[PDB]
Design a protein around this ligand. Structure first.
Ligand SMILES: CSC[C@H]1O[C@@H](n2cnc3c(N)ncnc32)[C@H](O)[C@@H]1O
Lengths: 625, 310
């Protein structure tokens, strides 16, 4: 259940060692590919001409074992950023030599330390290796939660450790990573191997790493406390952290020698398996969403496109959502037909955008539960779904349901509706163009008719996540603007991210719309107070809707409808990550724009720095009318 | 070839130490090839080294030897790549080398060891940044110290004081220690960072002065009581991996380097001898107790050289 590996800096025979760590339960081994103390010279004779072999042979393992079981390690004497020119040069040749041998062997990852502030020349040699061969190898940068200088015992009489808080100084190692990965151009092949120390820092330091590509956590044996019986275990705070890392499915690495000599080395590993099997199980939402974490999908456009059969199938296997719809219809019948009229009065109810008819059925179940009489129109422009409707109305619904194979903005209705019902809502509420559709339909609502839904509001929340920035970055396509992937929302089960401020309402729409001048364009300015240092990579979009009175649906996290998985949030990325300091305000601007043919959005940040206006005129993303 | 002695001796020689009577201790590691390990050798005939059939005793360790030191006349203290400090003890017959304790207390390669003046204690330095004080009698760690911020490069015990020893590190600190004080370590040396210190040698006569070499080939002479770096010389073209004072009443200072050369210096750090005999890194040096102008050096070229010093 937990994928884990052993870190060693001493491997006398690779064959035995691998067997010993395989025996102890580990899935892989991080080891030197050259001997850690074998400093090599490349410039100065005689040491330059040291007889070979320079390291052990690749014939000692199978290609399968190299490819899956061995993580290389950079020799600790390699210092590309030494103040000494000779050492700078020797280490460049040595780092290339070692990275090439790693690529020669097919290693799946290779570890490299970030153990000081200036790693500029380290980054440059790594960048220059990545661009030589076009390989698939991973590079795990070994970064501590707490720099060793900020962790040393207070035992130097004339150089004491400062006992003041330094909010940003305590984050310094995040800035080591962050510079290093900027320099290297956000290569997808460069991840974090976060090293965890005996005493954790404040939460804000730990939260700097939210949204970062952590592929591994390194746990030294040092940090394991001992319980009464004598096993290795972890403090409650370390356990909290392990639980967070498990949700990131990192691989855990155990480094250091055995410090619980009475017990063996399974015990460390077993504790993690213990913590792993002993976490809260995934709810119904989190079962549905497994496999979609941070997976970028295009927002459905059910107006412009005819949805596929299986797409309506997923729409329908959300029972919570139609319970709410049924209840909203139920309450609405009772308000509209008094008990003494329950048989003289028949309500004309129109499902607008009927699909395969889950709302048509919810309306029937609602009029039975409410014991009132209804007349049902099922309008649907997708003629492939109208096939399903007309088979349902012949086989079951009967003449109670009139299927109408038409666009609701075209349909000349025979009579007016008491209630129009629709599920035309996207993850950003109005992003499937439900405002435009219901406006062309309201002319055949009665002057006192209800619309279900009656109201919906969208929501927005600045987020940080370099993992999603890179994914968005990967979406460059030939034959279009090379930044176009940054100007267009994405539906995504947001996972490895940090939400920087509380969501805040963006655009609201009401139905029926009682403007004498209906206008669905919008301009909205939002200020988000940010109380952390972070980096802004875009905006999370959610929505709420009032179906009827107090019956609602929401995917706003604060008020999420429990158990309903019909909508993942939507992501509005920006071209250029923006640095945001503690106490600053993120000001964002959101426009809803439209043609006679297209609706779209445009957005900028204007504080703490300006961004470009994104998706201007719908050059990169429209929603078809 | 005595029993229990490997038929062949690893190519990379790290340590070369003369006992009181003039017998030569040799530490070696295998830093390349299929198997990465080490061995300890005793040569009552110093001129027969490095030859394996002409040794008095030998043994194999699990892993490489990074530093070495005598513990009296029968004890051998080993800094292992395994993270173990090891104590080996000579035979009564002095024809075997038998393991006494192997304690895995460091979490990375142990890089340096030094016995304290009483001979009953030692301090080890490691790549795990910790420094440990050991009871060789009890085979336990008395203290563990995380004073440094990077790997520990060298720990040198005081000649005549169990309480005092030097350490240096890649964090650019030279720490004078005194376990009598509640904050035992004390940062000394120049305020300007300079270059990383790599080697330390206490002065055998003036127990308040020491010398340290840096990664840039400079040797420096320092008084722990007065001002800051009175004297220094650019002796080498690369890192200074070792500094050994001669037994003479007015001692000479031997200077080792990755530039593959030996230098012998006087009290003012002027150059007296210089040897190009080695074709790889010069790793250790000891003066003969018997003839005080004889100077032995070993290296990664597997040579054991014997120098005569004017
Ligand atoms: C169940 S998701 C919304 C459904 O409403 C339909 N729909 C969207 N816009 C319109 C429209 N203008 N007229 C009729 N049906 C529509 C879509 O084809 C889809 O089946």
């Amino acid at each position: 259940r937990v994928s884990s590996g052993r870190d060693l800096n001493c491997v006398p025979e690779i064959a035995d060692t691998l067997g010993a760590v395989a025996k102890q339960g580990f899935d892989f081994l991080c080891m030197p590919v050259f001997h850690p103390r074998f400093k090599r010279e490349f410039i100065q004779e005689p040491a330059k001409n040291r007889p070979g072999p320079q390291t052990r042979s690749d014939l000692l393992l199978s290609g399968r074992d190299w490819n899956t079981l061995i993580v290389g390690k950079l020799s600790p004497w390699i210092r590309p950023d030494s103040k000494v020119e000779k050492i700078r040069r020797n280490s460049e040749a040595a780092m290339l030599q070692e990275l090439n041998f790693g690529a020669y062997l097919g290693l799946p990852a290779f570890l490299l330390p970030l153990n000081q502030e200036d790693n500029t020349n380290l980054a440059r040699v790594l960048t220059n290796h990545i661009h030589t061969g076009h390989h698939s190898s991973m590079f795990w940068m070994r970064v501590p939660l707490v720099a060793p200088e900020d962790l040393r015992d207070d035992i130097i009489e004339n150089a004491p450790t400062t006992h003041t808080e330094e909010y940003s100084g305590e984050e310094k190692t995040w800035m080591w990573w962050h510079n290093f990965r900027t320099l290297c151009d956000y290569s997808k092949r460069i991840a974090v191997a976060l090293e965890i120390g005996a005493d954790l820092p404040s939460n804000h330091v730990i939260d700097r790493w939210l949204g970062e590509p952590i592929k591994a956590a390194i746990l030294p044996t040092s940090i394991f406390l001992t319980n009464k019986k004598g096993f290795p275990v972890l403090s409650k705070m370390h356990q909290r952290l392990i639980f967070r890392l498990l949700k990131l499915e990192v691989q855990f690495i155990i480094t250091g020698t055995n410090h619980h000599s009475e017990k063996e080395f399974c015990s460390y590993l077993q504790y993690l398996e213990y913590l792993s099997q002993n976490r809260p199980p995934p709810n119904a939402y989190e079962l549905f969403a497994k496999g979609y974490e941070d997976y970028l999908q295009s927002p459905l456009q059910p107006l412009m496109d005819n949805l596929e059969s299986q797409t309506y199938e997923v729409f329908e296997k959300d029972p919570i959502k139609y319970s709410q719809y049924q209840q909203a219809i139920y309450k609405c019948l009772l308000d509209r037909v008094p008990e003494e009229e329950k048989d003289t009065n028949v309500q004309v109810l129109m499902v607008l955008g009927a699909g395969r008819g889950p709302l048509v059925n919810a309306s029937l179940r609602a009029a039975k539960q409410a014991d009132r009489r209804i007349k049902l129109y099922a309008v649907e422009k997708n003629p492939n779904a109208v096939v399903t409707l007309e088979n349902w109305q012949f086989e079951e619904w009967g003449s109670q349901v009139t299927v109408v194979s038409s666009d609701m903005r075209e349909w000349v209705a025979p009579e007016k509706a008491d209630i129009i019902v629709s599920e035309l809502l996207g993850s950003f509420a109005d992003n499937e163009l439900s405002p435009e559709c219901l406006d062309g339909a309201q002319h055949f609502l009665k002057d006192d008719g209800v619309s279900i839904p009656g109201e919906y509001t969208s929501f927005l929340a600045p987020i940080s996540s370099s993992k999603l920035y890179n994914e968005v970055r990967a979406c460059r396509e030939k034959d279009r603007d090379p930044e176009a992937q940054f100007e267009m929302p994405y539906v995504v089960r947001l996972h490895n991210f940090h939400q920087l401020s509380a969501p805040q309402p963006c655009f609201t729409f009401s139905h029926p719309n009682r403007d004498p001048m209906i206008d669905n364009n919008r301009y909205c300015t939002l200020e988000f107070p940010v109380e952390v240092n972070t980096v802004l990579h875009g905006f999370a979009g959610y929505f709420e809707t009032v179906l009827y009175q107090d019956i609602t649906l929401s995917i706003r996290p604060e008020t999420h409808s429990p158990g309903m998985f019909s909508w993942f949030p939507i992501l509005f990325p920006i071209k250029q990550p923006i640095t945001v300091r503690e106490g600053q305000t993120i000001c964002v601007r959101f426009w809803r724009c439209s043609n006679s043919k297209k609706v779209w959005y445009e957005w900028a940040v204007t504080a703490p720095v300006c961004s470009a206006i994104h998706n201007p005129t719908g050059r990169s993303y429209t929603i078809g009318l | 070839l005595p029993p229990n002695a490997p038929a062949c001796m690893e190519r990379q020689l790290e340590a070369a130490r003369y006992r009181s009577d003039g017998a030569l201790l040799l530490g070696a590691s295998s830093l390349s090839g299929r198997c990465w390990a080490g061995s300890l050798w005793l040569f009552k005939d110093p001129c027969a080294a490095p030859n394996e059939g002409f040794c008095s005793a030998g043994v194999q360790t699990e892993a490489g030897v990074a530093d070495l030191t005598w513990v009296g006349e029968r004890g051998i203290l080993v800094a292992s790549d395994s993270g173990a400090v090891e104590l080996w003890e000579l035979d009564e017959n002095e024809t075997l080398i038998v393991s006494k304790f192997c304690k895995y207390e460091h979490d990375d390669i142990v890089s340096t060891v030094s016995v304290l003046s009483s001979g009953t204690q030692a301090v080890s330095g490691s790549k795990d940044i910790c420094i440990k004080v050991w009871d060789l009698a009890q085979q336990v760690v008395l203290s563990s110290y995380r004073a440094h911020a990077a790997q520990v490069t060298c720990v040198a015990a005081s000649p005549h004081k169990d309480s005092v020893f030097l350490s240096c590190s890649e964090d650019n600190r030279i720490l004078l220690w005194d376990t009598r004080c509640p904050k035992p370590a004390s940062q000394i040396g120049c305020s300007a960072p300079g270059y990383l210190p790599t080697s330390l040698a206490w002065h055998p006569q003036q127990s308040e002065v020491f010398v340290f070499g840096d990664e840039n080939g400079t040797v420096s002479l320092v008084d722990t009581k007065s001002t800051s770096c009175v004297l220094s010389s650019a002796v080498h073209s690369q890192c200074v991996t070792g500094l050994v004072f001669s037994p003479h009443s007015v001692p000479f200072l031997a200077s080792l380097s990755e530039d593959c050369s030996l230098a012998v210096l006087d009290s003012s750090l002027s150059e007296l001898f210089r040897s190009q005999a080695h074709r790889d890194f010069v790793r250790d040096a000891t003066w003969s107790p018997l003839n005080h102008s004889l100077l032995t050096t070993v290296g990664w070229d597997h040579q054991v050289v014997h120098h005569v010093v004017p």
